[PDB]
Amino acid sequence: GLFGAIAGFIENGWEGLIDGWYGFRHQNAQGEGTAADYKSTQSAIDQITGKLNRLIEKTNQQFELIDNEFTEVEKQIGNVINWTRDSMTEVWSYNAELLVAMENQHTIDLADSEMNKLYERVKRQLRENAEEDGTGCFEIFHKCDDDCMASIRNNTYDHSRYREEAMQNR
Amino acid sequence: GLFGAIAGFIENGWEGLIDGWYGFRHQNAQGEGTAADYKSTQSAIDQITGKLNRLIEKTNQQFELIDNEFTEVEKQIGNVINWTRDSMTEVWSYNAELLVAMENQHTIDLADSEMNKLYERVKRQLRENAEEDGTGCFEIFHKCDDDCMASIRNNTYDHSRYREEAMQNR
Amino acid sequence: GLFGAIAGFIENGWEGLIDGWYGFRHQNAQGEGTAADYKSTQSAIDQITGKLNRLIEKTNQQFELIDNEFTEVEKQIGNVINWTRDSMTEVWSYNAELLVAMENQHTIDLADSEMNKLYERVKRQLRENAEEDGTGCFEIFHKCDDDCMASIRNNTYDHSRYREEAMQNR
Amino acid sequence: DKICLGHHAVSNGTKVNTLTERGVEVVNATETVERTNVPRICSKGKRTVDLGQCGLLGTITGPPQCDQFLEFSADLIIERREGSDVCYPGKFVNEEALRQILRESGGIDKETMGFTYSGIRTNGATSACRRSGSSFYAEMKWLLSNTDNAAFPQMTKSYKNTRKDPALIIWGIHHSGSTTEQTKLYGSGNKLITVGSSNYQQSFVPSPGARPQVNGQSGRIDFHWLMLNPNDTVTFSFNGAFIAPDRASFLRGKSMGIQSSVQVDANCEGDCYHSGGTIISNLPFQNINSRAVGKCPRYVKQESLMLATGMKNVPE
Amino acid sequence: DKICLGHHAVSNGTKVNTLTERGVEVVNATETVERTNVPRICSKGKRTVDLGQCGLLGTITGPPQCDQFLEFSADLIIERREGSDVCYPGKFVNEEALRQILRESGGIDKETMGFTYSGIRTNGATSACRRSGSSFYAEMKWLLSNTDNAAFPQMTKSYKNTRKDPALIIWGIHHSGSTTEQTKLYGSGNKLITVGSSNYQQSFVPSPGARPQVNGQSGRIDFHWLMLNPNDTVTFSFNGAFIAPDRASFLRGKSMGIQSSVQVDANCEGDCYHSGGTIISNLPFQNINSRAVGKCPRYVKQESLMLATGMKNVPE
Amino acid sequence: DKICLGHHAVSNGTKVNTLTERGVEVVNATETVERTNVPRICSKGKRTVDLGQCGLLGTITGPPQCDQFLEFSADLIIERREGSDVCYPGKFVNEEALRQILRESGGIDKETMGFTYSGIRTNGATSACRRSGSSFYAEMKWLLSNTDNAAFPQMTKSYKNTRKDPALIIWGIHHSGSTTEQTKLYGSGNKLITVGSSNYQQSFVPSPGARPQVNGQSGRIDFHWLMLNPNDTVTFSFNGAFIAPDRASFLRGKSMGIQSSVQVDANCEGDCYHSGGTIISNLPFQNINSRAVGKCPRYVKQESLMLATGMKNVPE
Ligand SMILES: CC(=O)N[C@H]1[C@H]([C@H](O)[C@H](O)CO)O[C@@](OC[C@H]2O[C@@H](O)[C@H](O)[C@@H](O)[C@H]2O)(C(=O)O)C[C@@H]1O
Ligand SMILES: CC(=O)N[C@H]1[C@H]([C@H](O)[C@H](O)CO)O[C@@](OC[C@H]2O[C@@H](O)[C@H](O)[C@@H](O)[C@H]2O)(C(=O)O)C[C@@H]1O
Ligand SMILES: CC(=O)N[C@H]1[C@H]([C@H](O)[C@H](O)CO)O[C@@](OC[C@H]2O[C@@H](O)[C@H](O)[C@@H](O)[C@H]2O)(C(=O)O)C[C@@H]1O
Ligand SMILES: *[C@@H]1O[C@H](CO)[C@@H](O[C@@H]2O[C@H](CO)[C@@H](O)[C@H](O)[C@H]2NC(C)=O)[C@H](O)[C@H]1NC(C)=O
Ligand SMILES: *[C@@H]1O[C@H](CO)[C@@H](O[C@@H]2O[C@H](CO)[C@@H](O)[C@H](O)[C@H]2NC(C)=O)[C@H](O)[C@H]1NC(C)=O
Ligand SMILES: *[C@@H]1O[C@H](CO)[C@@H](O[C@@H]2O[C@H](CO)[C@@H](O)[C@H](O)[C@H]2NC(C)=O)[C@H](O)[C@H]1NC(C)=O
Ligand SMILES: *[C@@H]1O[C@H](CO)[C@@H](O)[C@H](O)[C@H]1NC(C)=O
Ligand SMILES: *[C@@H]1O[C@H](CO)[C@@H](O)[C@H](O)[C@H]1NC(C)=O
Ligand SMILES: *[C@@H]1O[C@H](CO)[C@@H](O)[C@H](O)[C@H]1NC(C)=O
Ligand SMILES: *[C@@H]1O[C@H](CO)[C@@H](O)[C@H](O)[C@H]1NC(C)=O
Ligand SMILES: *[C@@H]1O[C@H](CO)[C@@H](O)[C@H](O)[C@H]1NC(C)=O
Ligand SMILES: *[C@@H]1O[C@H](CO)[C@@H](O)[C@H](O)[C@H]1NC(C)=O
C-alpha cells in the first residue's frame, strides 16, 4: 500500500479478529485481550460498499439486432457490422480491465490508509505517556488496566491523569 | 480523504478564513488571530487548475452527417448507423462518468494531502518546544508572542532559542 | 507528490547516489558517507515494472480490411466506415492520454510514498535517541560510528543500548 | 505495559489484479463478468409471440404456417430457425430491412386495400400452399387471364393511405418456370409492372426460365414492399405476372425481436437475450454472447475480472 | 500557548460524485456537460450558403428554385426542410451518397459538355418547371423526336474530362405516364439507354405507366450520376426517353454541410452545429443533440457531471 | 551526530504529463506510441502470395496475368496497385464483397462444372486476352451461335454442389459494342439469362451499345457471382450473351488479405500490416497508419505519450 501499514510496519494481520477489520490487542498485568474498532471498520466498509453501488449495474440502453444468424446478411454490410462489433468488444474489454485494476489499487490503498489513520489517532491520544515500538505497538510506561485500555479504545482516555508517572518512568 | 486531516482529525473548516485554503489560528497572551498560508493554498490551486486545463477542451476532430433528418436513409444502413452511434453514446457516457468520479476522488485526496503536509511541516519546525493536541493544534510550552507566531507562519522560527524553556516547562 | 517528501521536505535528490533509488547519507566523527537502500529501491522498481508488464502489449484481436485504397468502395458505405473509424480514433486517443496521465500521477506518488515510508521506518528505529531536523535528517545525540550507522541501515540498531546517553544528552 | 493496532486476515484469500501487480491476494473479492446463462427465453410479464414455423416476413403475405400470425400483437417477437416466409418459393427484396421493421413493430394490424377486379381471374392457387387442398398466400391474390393464353388487360389500381401512420404495402412478381407457362397464364408479350408513390418509383419486367424445384415448383415469386405515408397514394400499373396485395399492414407500436433456439419461460424475467437464452445479471460485463440484445451487460473477452472488496490479505 | 492548523469552508457547498460516494459536498465545482444551446446557426467568418427552397441535389440539375445556386461557393452549406431537388417529379439513384459528396464539396463550378444535336428536338418543357411560362431543368435538355410519333434515331454522345479533378456527370431517364405518351415523344419500340466509362458500366430501359400526379405530372424522371476521372471518357448511347446533361459539375474544395430549422447569425462563431442550432462550448461533453456535427463536445446521456474544484466542505 | 535520508536524481530528466500537470520531469520514461515503420511486408514463416499484376478477382476468372494464381494457397495475400482483374474489359457486381471473401479464403481450389454443349460454338476469343495469339478467360467459356447471325437455342445447364463447403460460382453477361454485333454473335431478339438456386433468384437482359474503348474493346462483360450451398443446385437458363463458368471455386481455409506498395521480406516477422509496410512493436498504441490491419497496436492521433518509469527528478 501507499501508507506502509498493512503489509508494512504491521508485519501481519490477525485471523482471530472476526469482529471487525481493524482492532486493538493489548498487554497488561491483567493479561492479553483483543477488540475491533467500529469507526475505522465502518469507514472502510462504507467506501467499498459505495464502489459496488456505482459499478454493479448495467445500462437502461437498448440495442436491437442488426444482423442475422439464420439467414446471413449481405457480405459487405456484414463485414462492416462485424468490424464495428469487434472494435466495441476491444474498447469494452480494455475499459473493464482498466476499471478493475484501478479500483483494486485504490481499494487496497484505502484500507491501508484507514489503518494508518487509526494508528495515528491513538498516537495523538497517548502524547508523552507512550512510545512507538515500530511493529504497530505503543509501549505505555505507566500502569494501564482494562478500564485504561477501554478508555483508549473508546477515545475517552485522559493523558494528563497518568502524565506525571509516565513522564518520570521514561 | 486518504490523509485523515480534512474531515478527519481536524474536526471542521473555518468560514472566517476567506484569504486562502489553509491557514493558522493562534492563541497567546495577546489574544487570538488567524492567517492564510500562501504556499499550501497555491500548491492545491495550481494542481486543480492543471486538471481543468487538461479537461476543459473539445477535439479538433471533425465529423460530418452520415444520415438525414429530412429524407430518411435506407432502413438497413440507417439501423447500422443508429446502432453505431448508440454504442458510441454508451462508451462516452461511461468514460465521462468514470473520468469525473476518478478526478473528484483524487481532487479531494489532493486537498487533504496538502493540509496534512502543512501540519507536518509545522510539527517539524517546533521540535521539542510543542506537543500535538490531536485536534490539529500544537500546544507550545514557552511564551510565544505575535512575532513568535509570525515566525512560525513565515518558517523563520528558531526552535533552539526557546528550547531551554519549553524543555523545562514540559 | 501526495506524501510531501520527494520535491517536498527533502529539498532535492542526489546525483551521486548511483547505486539505488533511495539512500542514506550520514555525518559522524569518522566523516561523511552514502549508501543505497535495497528494500525501498526494490519495492518501487518492482511496482513500476508491474505497470510496464500490464501496459506494454497489444491484443491478439485481428482486424481485416473493410475498405479499399486502390479502387474506392461505394460512397455511402465508405462514409459510414470513415465515420466509424474516426470515432474509434477519438475513443482510443482519449483512452491513451488518460491512461498515461493517470499512470504517471500514480507512479510519481508511488515513489514519494516509498521515500516517506523509509523515512518513517528510520524514525521509529531511533525512538528518543534522535530528533527530526525537518530537511529529511535525524540528529543523533549519542556518538554513532560506522557500525552504529551500518546497524541503522541494516535495521539491526538497538536503541536501548544508547538510550541512557541520548536521553541525558537531550 | 502496551497496546497494539492491527487488522484482520484470513487463511484463504482471493487473487485480484492491480495497476502494479497480478494476483495480489485480498480478504474478499467479487466477480464483475457474468458467465452464467439461463438456457430459456425469460419472458415473464411480456406479451410474447413465438413464430415457430412462421417466418417473420410471412406474417405479411400469409403462407399457411403463418395463418395464426396475420394480425399479432407483441412486446417480444421470437424468430426460430425452422421459420419459413414462403409456401410458393420466392423471396423479398430488401428482406433484412423489412425484418428489422417488423421486429420493432409491436406487431401488425391488417386492412383491406379495397381492390376489385373485372376481366381477369383472381383465384390462382398451388399445391405448394396447402389448406386442405391447393391455396395461396392469405393476404395476396394471384391475378390471372380469364382463360389459357388470353391477353391480360393493361390495368391500373390505386390505394390511398387515409390513416395517421405509414402503410406497409407488398406485392409480388411471378416468374414462371418457362416462357410458354408465362404466356399460358398472362398472354404473350413482354409484360411490365409499374409502381409509384410520391416518394418511390420503380418498374419490373418478369423473367421466366427454369429454376431448380423448391416445394415442388420451378417458378418463383419476387416479393417487393414500400412504406406508404399518410395521405400518399400508390398506383400499380401492370400487364400480368403480378401478385396483388389484398391487404395493407400497419405497425402497432413498439417491440423487440430476437432469434433463439430455446424454450420460452414465464417464470423468469430478463431483458438481455441471445440465441442460447437469457442473461440475468446486475454485473456490468458479460462473457456469454457478443451478439446479445436488449438491455445487456457489456460483452468483454475476459472470462473473469475480480473486484477487491477487502484489504490485502496478510496471514502469518 | 498554542497554534492551530485548519482549512476554509463555506455555508453552501456543491455536491459531486466520487469513486466511493454519491453527493459528497465540496467547496466549489464546475460543470463538464454542456446543456446551453444557441438557437441559431452561428456562421461568423464563414462563407455560408443557405439553400432555402433549393434542394442540394437541385444545384446540379437546376429546377427554378435553384437558379441562384448553380455555381455556388461555400465553407458551410445549409439544407432546409422546405428544400426540393425537383420541379418535374423524379428522384436520384444513390441520392444520399451524392448529397454527402456535395455537402463537403466547397460548392460547384459548371462547364459545358459540348454536346450538339441534329435530327431531334432539344427544348422539351413542362408546366411543372415555371420560369414565366413552361421551362425545364436549367442544366439539362429534354431530347425529343422532331415531331409527334417519329422514331428517335439511335444516338451516341461522348464527353472527355480534360480537367485535373473528377467530373460529376448527371443524366435522366424519362418515364411517361403511359405507353402512348412515350411513343408520341420518342417513337414506338422498347428504347434503350447505355452509359459507360472506363470504370463504370450500366444500362437503362424506361418504363411508362400511370403514377399519381405530383406537381401536376403522372410522369417521372430517373436522375443518375457518375464521377468521371481525369482523362476518362463517358459515352451515352440512347434511343429516346433520355434527359441529356448540358453541363458537367466540378467540386471547388472543402466544406461542411448541415441540416437546420433556425436562422443564420453572423454575430456568433461556432463549429458544432445541429438542427436546433449551434453548441458553443469548451466543455468536453454535451447533452443537447447526439447528431451534432462539426467539431463538437462528445454527446453523453447524463444531464450533468460536476467536477470538484475545491476540497471537501466541512462546515461546523 | 546525524543521518539523512534521500533519493537519486539526474542532470537530464524526461518530461511527462500527469493529471494535474504538463511537462513534469522524471528520472526516466518510456514511449507508449509507436512511430517506427518497417517499409517491407514482413512475411517470415507465412505462406505468402503476392498477386503482382493479377487482380484478386481475376484468380476466379483467369485473365492471362492470373494464369499462375488459379489455385493458390495462402496465409497472407498481397494485392498490388498494378493488379487487374480483367483482360476483356468488364467488372464484377458486388465486387468488394467478393474481394473480402477471397482475402480471408486461404486461397482457392478449382473443380469442373461438368458442363458440355451441343448446337453452339464454345471457343470465343479476343485480342484483349493474349496467350501467344487471341484467347479468353481461362476459367470461362465464351458461348456463341454456330455461325454468324444464327439463333442461339434456349439452353438450360445445372450444377449441383456435391461438396461439404459452399461453392463460388461465377458467370458473365456480354454487352456487345452494338446491336448488330450482338445479333451477329447470338442471333436477333432480346436475349434473356436466368439464374436461380434455392436461396438466390435473379435475371439479366443484355444491353448492347457503344462504350469507350478499353484494352481495344468497346464491348463489356458483366461478371456475377453466388455462393452455392452444399447439396444446392444452380440452374442457368440463357438465350445468348452468356459467358459460362467452366469451373467452380472452393475456399481452402483461412487467410488475411492486404494492400501494399512495398516489397516482401522473409527476414522479419510481423502481424500488423499497412500499405507502407509492417508495424513491429509491443507498444499498445501507434501513430503510423489508421488503416493498419492484422493484430495491431491501437491507432491514436498523438505522436508521443511518455510513461514515467521513475520518480520526479529534483536536481540541485
Ligand atoms: C394459377 C395457376 O396457374 N396455378 C397452377 C400452377 C402454376 O401454373 C405454376 O405454379 C406457375 O409456375 O401450377 C400448379 O401445378 C404445377 C405443379 O403441380 C404439381 O401437382 C406437380 O406435382 C408439379 O410437378 C407441377 O406440375 C401448382 O400446383 O402450382 C397448378 C396450379 O393450379
Ligand atoms: C416535352 C413535352 O412533351 N412536354 C409536354 C409534357 C410532356 O408530354 C409530359 O409531361 C410527359 O409526361 O406535358 C405537358 O402537359 C401535360 C400537363 O399539362 C398541364 O397543363 C395539365 O394541367 C396537365 O393535366 C397535363 O396535361 C406539361 O406541361 O408537362 C406539356 C409539355 O409541353
Ligand atoms: C467471340 C468473338 O466474336 N470474338 C471476336 C471479338 C468479338 O466479336 C467482340 O470483341 C465482341 O465485342 O472481336 C474481335 O475483334 C474486335 C477487335 O479486333 C482488333 O484486332 C481490332 O484492333 C479492334 O479494332 C476490334 O476490331 C476481338 O479481337 O475481340 C475478334 C474476336 O474473334
Ligand atoms: C460475422 O461474425 C459472425 C460470428 O460472430 C460470423 O458467423 C459465424 O460464422 C461461423 C463460420 O462460418 C459459424 O460457425 C457460426 O455459426 C457463425 N456465428 C453466428 C453467430 O452467426 C459471420 O459469418 C461474420 N459475418 C460475415 C459477413 O463474414
Ligand atoms: C435512427 O434514430 C433516429 C433518431 O435518432 C430516428 O429518427 C427519429 O424517429 C422518430 C420516430 O420515428 C421521430 O419522432 C424523430 O423525428 C426522428 N429523429 C430524427 C433526428 O430524425 C430514426 O428513425 C432511426 N433510424 C432508423 C433507420 O430507424
Ligand atoms: C475515407 O478516408 C480516406 C482516408 O482515410 C479517404 O481516402 C483518401 O482520400 C484522399 C483525398 O481524396 C487521398 O489523397 C488519399 O490518397 C486517400 N487515402 C486512402 C488511404 O485511401 C476516402 O476518400 C474517404 N472515403 C470516402 C468515401 O470519402
Ligand atoms: C465476500 O464476497 C462475496 C461476493 O463475491 C459475498 O457473497 C460474501 O458475503 C463476502 N463475504 C464476507 C465475509 O463478507
Ligand atoms: C391528411 O389529410 C387529411 C384530410 O383528409 C388532413 O386532416 C390531415 O391534416 C392530412 N395529414 C397530413 C400529414 O397532411
Ligand atoms: C467556483 O466555480 C465556478 C465555476 O463553476 C466559478 O465561476 C467561480 O469563480 C468559482 N468560485 C470561486 C470562489 O472560486
Ligand atoms: C491526362 O492527359 C494529359 C495529356 O493531355 C497529361 O498531361 C496528363 O498527365 C494526364 N493525366 C493523368 C492522370 O494521366
Ligand atoms: C530508461 O528507460 C529506457 C526506455 O525508454 C530504457 O532503455 C533504459 O534502460 C532506462 N534507463 C535506466 C537507467 O534504467
Ligand atoms: C448432402 O447430401 C448427402 C447425400 O448425398 C448427405 O450425406 C448429407 O447429409 C447432405 N448434407 C446436408 C447438409 O444436408
TrEMBL record, chains D, E, F:
Please indicate which superkingdom the organism of origin belongs to.
Answer: Viruses
Q: Name one GO cellular component term.
A: host cell plasma membrane
Subunit composition and interactions: Homotrimer of disulfide-linked HA1-HA2.
Keyword Transcription regulation carried by entry: no
As for family, the record states: Belongs to the influenza viruses hemagglutinin family.
Q: List the disulfide bonds.
A: 42-268, 54-66, 87-129, 272-296
UniProt membrane topology term:
Single-pass type I membrane protein
Recorded GO MF terms: host cell surface receptor binding
Q: What is the lineage of its organism?
A: Viruses, Riboviria, Orthornavirae, Negarnaviricota, Polyploviricotina
Q: Which GO terms describe its biological process?
A: clathrin-dependent endocytosis of virus by host cell; fusion of virus membrane with host endosome membrane; fusion of virus membrane with host plasma membrane; virion attachment to host cell
Keywords per UniProt: Clathrin- and caveolin-independent endocytosis of virus by host, Clathrin-mediated endocytosis of virus by host, Disulfide bond, Fusion of virus membrane with host endosomal membrane, Fusion of virus membrane with host membrane, Glycoprotein, Hemagglutinin, Host cell membrane, Host membrane, Host-virus interaction, Lipoprotein, Membrane, Palmitate, Transmembrane, Transmembrane helix, Viral attachment to host cell, Viral envelope protein, Viral penetration into host cytoplasm, Virion, Virus endocytosis by host, Virus entry into host cell
Q: What is this protein called?
A: Hemagglutinin
Keyword Membrane found: yes
Q: Where in the cell is it found?
A: Host apical cell membrane
Residues bearing attached sugar chains per UniProt: 28, 231
Q: What does this protein do?
A: Binds to sialic acid-containing receptors on the cell surface, bringing about the attachment of the virus particle to the cell. This attachment induces virion internalization of about two third of the virus particles through clathrin-dependent endocytosis and about one third through a clathrin- and caveolin-independent pathway. Plays a major role in the determination of host range restriction and virulence. Class I viral fusion protein.
